[PDB]
Write a protein that binds this DNA or RNA. Structure first.
Ligand SMILES: [Zn+2]
Lengths: 76, 95, 103, 94, 76, 184
DNA sequence: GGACTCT
DNA sequence: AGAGTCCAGCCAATGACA
RNA sequence: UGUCAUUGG
């Protein structure tokens, strides 16, 4: 609540950088309209935005990106 | 991964859906060719990216388009990354 | 001194927890379940006569696990982490898998 | 505390997935020969088929769905889910 | 117009294609998704898979692998 | 400015004197055990004499109202007039009237803070680096029009990070950092 | 019924 | 100082009715 | 396909 320069309540998003899908999932009916007015371009890094686009959240095992090293398969 | 597989649509209900990177809506297959009608009427030929989202996500985006809000998705053309070997690290204390 | 802090944080990157080893095991198990080639030594038909979790753990301790995890801007194999941490978490995972009758 | 008892109507209705690969192709062929397979998903044609003899070719990536067996992890819970110990995942017992 | 460059082509492999027949599947994927197709003005005619440089790490998605293959690309 | 809200300002000016003799000191109410004030109150200018106990160094502050400012430097002066303004203004010597309604330095809610030197600032900036490329974490924010930033002010040392020593019921003291952002 | 905002 | 606007736990189960 | 009534944890 005191992560910005002023105490912020649990009802609104005033200073914290919250995405439009986070504000719409929290409950704000004019969130996408205000994002369309101000032409907002937001990255998808939160749970409410990851569940919309069927992305794995950045929580727990989804905190890391996983690759496969095809070197040992191509070597033999 | 558990909550991802729960909240997303079933693996049996999969179909190749393409989205337009310029205007944001679902591409169409006219007679085998993935086209965007809005951009072929506007004399463009933009990128079409395959997406794997839920059907309710597409219904929500199309209804927000019907309200007038254009929703345009951008995709990660990530630079190709290479695994390099790392040195040995021992985290045991020294007594 | 900023180089010293960067070295300390690069040494801190080698810590492994249950989330990282569970994600590595889940990625390799999902890839092996859909038909990827098991990258174990002594490849035979007998290796397709045992269960797949034994193959995953053998790939982990043999150093031939194909999964690379991106953590703190670095790319780590499962053998780039602390060996005692990998052993500490795999002992617990093998214990609870033996309670579940799947290992 | 690591287990949960499942009634017979649930495990007679609920199904579990067995993927087709190099490890489980003999078990899937044995379960298809004994009519224990309920569903079959063909991933390359991307379609599900309910088995009520037809022709099914088992490629890696396809799966079958049979009755759910013991020591399978079910995710069970009570409502309201006030904290994370409400929704756990333990092993099915008959 | 028509020229020859050194680029990357990003394709998707299924996990059953990560066998000992892997580069045949990579060649078939590159030839089906990128050969004889117009992608934003440029149109590659015949593509040769460059196989003297390190293969990059394969990024894992929900059920597939996304690899960026280095290639000699003849555009037209 | 009245005869009551000048003693609280005198307690503030002990901390300003401590910062003026050492910019990297830890400021809390315990600093008040090392100083001694003497107040000469008048409705035009109030003279506050802060004396260091062991070093016998004197500093005379001249406290004015915002309207009537008649500032000429006395000997052993601070070098800048202390102005009691009506509202919160930008300036290290301009204290608003709301800051002096109560005794603020002796309170339990008065923080414990330092200005970081270049070594500790470099350590904090390299800790905040996420390791991936040039990306960086941010510290939580704090406005420049705050009594901590007014106390910690030095004329040619820009104050960017303030380290706070929080009270902690289970660990004693906790370390936090705020970043000072600009106003007007 | 009750809290935030514009008037 | 006073009206507008939005907000009021989760998951159920039957029956009647439009 | 939604309302109303009654009930459960
Ligand atoms: Zn278009």
């Amino acid at each position: 609540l005191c992560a910005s320069y002023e105490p912020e309540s649990v009802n609104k998003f005033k200073f914290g950088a919250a995405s439009t899908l986070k504000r719409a999932t929290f409950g704000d009916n004019k969130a996408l309209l205000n994002a369309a007015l101000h032409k907002k371009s937001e990255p998808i890094n939160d749970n409410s935005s990851c569940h919309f686009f069927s992305k794995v959240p950045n929580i727990g095992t989804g905190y890391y990106k996983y690759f496969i090293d095809l070197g040992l398969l191509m070597r033999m | 991964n558990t909550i991802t597989e729960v909240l997303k649509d079933s693996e049996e209900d999969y179909q190749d859906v393409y989205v337009c990177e310029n205007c944001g809506d679902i591409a169409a297959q006219i007679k085998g060719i993935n086209t965007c009608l809005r951009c072929s009427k506007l004399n463009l030929s933009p990128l079409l990216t395959k997406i794997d989202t839920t059907h309710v996500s597409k219904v929500f985006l199309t209804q927000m388009n019907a309200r007038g809000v254009k929703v345009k998705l951008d995709f990660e053309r990530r630079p190709p990354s290479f695994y390099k070997p790392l040195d040995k690290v021992d985290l045991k204390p020294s007594f | 001194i900023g180089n010293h802090i960067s070295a300390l944080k690069r040494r801190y990157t080698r810590r492994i927890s249950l989330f990282e080893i569970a994600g590595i095991i889940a990625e390799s198990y999902n890839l092996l379940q859909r038909g990827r080639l098991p990258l174990v030594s002594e490849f035979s038909d007998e290796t397709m006569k045992q269960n797949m979790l034994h193959v995953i753990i053998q790939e982990i301790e043999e150093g031939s696990c194909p999964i690379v995890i991106e953590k703190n801007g670095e790319l780590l194999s499962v053998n780039d982490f602390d060996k005692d941490g990998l052993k500490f978490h795999l002992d617990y995972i093998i214990k609870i898998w033996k309670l579940q009758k799947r290992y | 505390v690591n287990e949960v008892g499942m009634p017979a109507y649930i495990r007679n209705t609920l199904t579990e997935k067995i993927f087709v690969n190099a490890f489980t192709v003999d078990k899937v062929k044995q379960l298809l020969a004994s009519n224990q397979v309920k569903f079959y998903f063909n991933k390359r044609l991307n379609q599900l088929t309910r088995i009520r003899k037809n022709k099914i070719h088992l490629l890696p990536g396809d799966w079958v769905e049979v009755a759910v067996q013991e020591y399978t992890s079910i995710i069970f819970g009570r409502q309201p889910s006030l904290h994370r110990y409400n929704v756990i995942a333990s092993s099915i017992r008959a | 117009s028509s020229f020859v460059t050194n680029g990357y082509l990003s394709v998707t492999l299924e996990p059953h294609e990560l066998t000992l027949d892997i580069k045949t599947n990579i060649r078939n994927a590159v030839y089906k998704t990128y050969l004889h197709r117009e992608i934003s003005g440029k149109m590659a005619k015949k593509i040769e898979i460059r196989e003297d440089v390190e293969l990059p790490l394969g990024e894992i998605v929900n059920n597939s692998v996304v690899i960026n293959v280095p290639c000699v690309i003849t555009y037209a | 400015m009245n005869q009551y809200n000048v003693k609280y300002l005198a307690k503030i000016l002990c901390l300003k004197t401590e910062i003026a003799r050492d910019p990297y000191a830890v400021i809390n109410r315990n600093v008040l055990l090392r100083y001694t004030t003497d107040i000469e109150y008048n409705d035009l200018v109030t003279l506050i004499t802060v004396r260091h106990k062991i070093d016998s160094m004197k500093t005379v502050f001249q406290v004015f109202n915002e309207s009537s400012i008649n500032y000429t430097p006395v000997d052993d002066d601070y070098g800048e007039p202390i102005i009691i303004t009506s509202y919160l203004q930008k300036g290290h010597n301009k204290f608003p009237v709301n800051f002096l309604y109560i005794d603020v330095v002796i309170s339990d809610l008065f923080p414990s803070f330092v200005r970081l030197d270049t070594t500790e600032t470099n350590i904090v900036n390299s800790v905040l680096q996420t390791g991936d490329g040039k990306k960086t974490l941010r510290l939580p924010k704090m406005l420049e029009t705050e009594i901590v930033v007014k106390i910690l002010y030095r004329p040619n040392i820009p104050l960017k990070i303030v380290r706070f020593f929080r009270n902690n019921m289970v660990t004693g003291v906790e370390i936090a950092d705020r970043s000072v952002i600009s106003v007007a």
